[PDB]
Design an enzyme around this catalytic site. Sequence first.
Site, PDB file in Angstrom:
ATOM      1  N   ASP A  67      -0.013 -84.408   5.705  1.00  0.00           N
ATOM      2  CA  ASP A  67      -0.539 -83.124   5.202  1.00  0.00           C
ATOM      3  C   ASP A  67       0.548 -82.081   5.240  1.00  0.00           C
ATOM      4  O   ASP A  67       1.351 -82.069   6.183  1.00  0.00           O
ATOM      5  CB  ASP A  67      -1.627 -82.560   6.085  1.00  0.00           C
ATOM      6  N   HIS A  69      -0.533 -78.692   3.622  1.00  0.00           N
ATOM      7  CA  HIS A  69      -1.425 -77.522   3.790  1.00  0.00           C
ATOM      8  C   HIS A  69      -0.744 -76.190   3.495  1.00  0.00           C
ATOM      9  O   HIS A  69      -0.901 -75.202   4.247  1.00  0.00           O
ATOM     10  CB  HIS A  69      -2.173 -77.476   5.122  1.00  0.00           C
ATOM     11  N   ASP A  96      -3.707 -83.440   1.070  1.00  0.00           N
ATOM     12  CA  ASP A  96      -3.865 -82.203   1.795  1.00  0.00           C
ATOM     13  C   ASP A  96      -2.632 -81.307   1.627  1.00  0.00           C
ATOM     14  O   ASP A  96      -1.999 -80.912   2.630  1.00  0.00           O
ATOM     15  CB  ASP A  96      -4.195 -82.507   3.256  1.00  0.00           C
ATOM     16  N   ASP A  99      -4.798 -75.485   1.050  1.00  0.00           N
ATOM     17  CA  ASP A  99      -5.744 -74.921   1.991  1.00  0.00           C
ATOM     18  C   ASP A  99      -5.053 -74.642   3.310  1.00  0.00           C
ATOM     19  O   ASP A  99      -4.071 -75.316   3.674  1.00  0.00           O
ATOM     20  CB  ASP A  99      -6.948 -75.816   2.222  1.00  0.00           C
ATOM     21  N   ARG A 100      -5.624 -73.632   3.983  1.00  0.00           N
ATOM     22  CA  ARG A 100      -5.229 -73.124   5.283  1.00  0.00           C
ATOM     23  C   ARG A 100      -3.916 -72.361   5.202  1.00  0.00           C
ATOM     24  O   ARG A 100      -3.881 -71.185   5.560  1.00  0.00           O
ATOM     25  CB  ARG A 100      -5.180 -74.227   6.309  1.00  0.00           C
ATOM     26  N   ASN A 128      -8.657 -84.962   1.322  1.00  0.00           N
ATOM     27  CA  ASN A 128      -9.982 -84.331   1.238  1.00  0.00           C
ATOM     28  C   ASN A 128      -9.923 -82.850   0.878  1.00  0.00           C
ATOM     29  O   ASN A 128     -10.955 -82.238   0.512  1.00  0.00           O
ATOM     30  CB  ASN A 128     -10.811 -84.488   2.496  1.00  0.00           C
ATOM     31  N   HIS A 129      -8.731 -82.231   0.969  1.00  0.00           N
ATOM     32  CA  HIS A 129      -8.645 -80.819   0.646  1.00  0.00           C
ATOM     33  C   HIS A 129      -8.206 -80.660  -0.776  1.00  0.00           C
ATOM     34  O   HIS A 129      -8.042 -79.533  -1.241  1.00  0.00           O
ATOM     35  CB  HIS A 129      -7.728 -80.097   1.590  1.00  0.00           C
ATOM     36  N   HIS A 177      -5.162 -91.105   2.513  1.00  0.00           N
ATOM     37  CA  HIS A 177      -5.199 -89.853   3.269  1.00  0.00           C
ATOM     38  C   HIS A 177      -6.063 -89.992   4.544  1.00  0.00           C
ATOM     39  O   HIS A 177      -5.644 -89.612   5.608  1.00  0.00           O
ATOM     40  CB  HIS A 177      -5.737 -88.637   2.441  1.00  0.00           C
ATOM     41  N   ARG A 225     -16.853 -85.050  11.741  1.00  0.00           N
ATOM     42  CA  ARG A 225     -16.783 -84.146  10.605  1.00  0.00           C
ATOM     43  C   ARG A 225     -18.074 -84.063   9.807  1.00  0.00           C
ATOM     44  O   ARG A 225     -18.175 -83.250   8.864  1.00  0.00           O
ATOM     45  CB  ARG A 225     -15.689 -84.622   9.656  1.00  0.00           C
ATOM     46  N   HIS A 252      -4.424 -86.771   7.876  1.00  0.00           N
ATOM     47  CA  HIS A 252      -5.818 -86.168   7.998  1.00  0.00           C
ATOM     48  C   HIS A 252      -6.139 -85.607   9.369  1.00  0.00           C
ATOM     49  O   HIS A 252      -7.075 -84.772   9.529  1.00  0.00           O
ATOM     50  CB  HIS A 252      -6.840 -87.202   7.483  1.00  0.00           C
TER      51      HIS A 252
HETATM   52 MN   LIG Z   1      -7.669 -84.153   5.566  1.00  0.00          MN
HETATM   53 MN   LIG Z   2      -5.674 -81.808   6.587  1.00  0.00          MN
END
Ligand SMILES: [Mn+2]
Ligand SMILES: [Mn+2]
Length: 324
Positions: A67, A69, A96, A99-100, A128-129, A177, A225, A252
């Site tokens: 990731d 991010h 990923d 995001d964030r 997943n993002h 991922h 989750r 992840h």
């Molecule tokens: Mn993830």
């Molecule tokens: Mn992530």
Amino acid sequence: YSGPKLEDGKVTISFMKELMQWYKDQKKLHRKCAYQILVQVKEVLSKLSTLVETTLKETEKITVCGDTHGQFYDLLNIFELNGLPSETNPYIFNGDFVDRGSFSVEVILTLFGFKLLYPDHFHLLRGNHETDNMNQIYGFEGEVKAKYTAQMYELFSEVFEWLPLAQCINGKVLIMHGGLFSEDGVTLDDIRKIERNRQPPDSGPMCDLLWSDPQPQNGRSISKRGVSCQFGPDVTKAFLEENNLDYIIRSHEVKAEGYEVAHGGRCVTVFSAPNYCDQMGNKASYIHLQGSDLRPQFHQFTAVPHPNVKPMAYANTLLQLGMM
Ligand SMILES: [Mn+2]
Ligand SMILES: [Mn+2]
């Protein structure tokens, strides 16, 4: 036409170097050029199998990153520490991207740009993002609406839908991922046939590839989750046996060390976002695999300076004004 410009409608290495410096300096890629990158990369991705299959000769290596991010300055650091991508320095970014982190637009357009430049040596797998439900709250939607318009976001979403879900190196290492499956009996043949151009279902293989985590104890458990499952070593073992694989690399999960080896060596986590969210204080890592030896070699790295922009700056007020 203002800022970096495509050469005859195409990405070139000069464009990419210009783009990275432009982004480094906090400037915006013109909407027409962002648009072109998106439409062209959509075409490229939409022709790939859900399972990318790669053959590494004995003398070749590839770098696997987890990731990122939206930590664009850490992305550039990866390329400074490990070399820019090219035909002789191939990369896989294991989901990923967004995001964030508050430079998600810069990470993703750089990543799509290098996919267009080295389409056979620069691989992107969905995370997943790279989905709507996550982007709407964890910052990417807000960032794209701030830098561009709502409609550009709708195009990013549609592009993400065409990202492959896994990649297999030499029929021996499978990279995804999230992880493995909530049910037994899933094969590489199944993965190749997944109809991936959609938002992930609430359950099933596509959801697991993007969402599952390994647990140390055998069997499966309800996911922490609220979607997919945790899978134990015996699940990993069964899957590798049935598919003639050696091990999996997935991402992840934040790790303090930027990686983890689990399941008797059969389940490797790699995570490439150091001092995650400006607060985790974790290291990040990237992996090298060679065709003569597919064992992973880990390379840890620490965060570097970025502009004074707080994480989740474009995110849900609830997350935005809830750390630092
Ligand atoms: Mn993830
Ligand atoms: Mn992530």
